[PDB]
């Protein structure tokens, strides 16, 4: 969708693997702010937003 109509999705009740996202080279910019990119496999959250 357009930038002024950005598409929002809620993710819950799942087992997420961020390693497969991080190791891929398809992404030009991979910038995480509040957490370290390599520690995402060691944390548990709820109500993720994309």
């Amino acid at each position: 969708a357009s930038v002024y109509a950005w598409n929002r999705k809620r993710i819950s009740n799942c087992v997420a693997d961020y390693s497969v996202l991080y190791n891929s080279a398809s992404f030009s910019t991979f910038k995480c702010y509040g957490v370290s990119p390599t520690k995402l496999n060691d944390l548990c959250f709820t109500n993720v937003y994309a």
Partner: protein
Amino acid sequence: STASALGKLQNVVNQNAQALNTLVKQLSSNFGAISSVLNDILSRLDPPE
């Protein structure tokens, strides 16, 4: 019969207890950081910050 005649010792004890209580309560302040518990900071982000 009459109580509250020993206010000085009570005041000393109360002052000591209050000082200890505020000292232990001070541990729950952010001080401008992202968290008040050190384990979360250690386990959530990469050392250089």
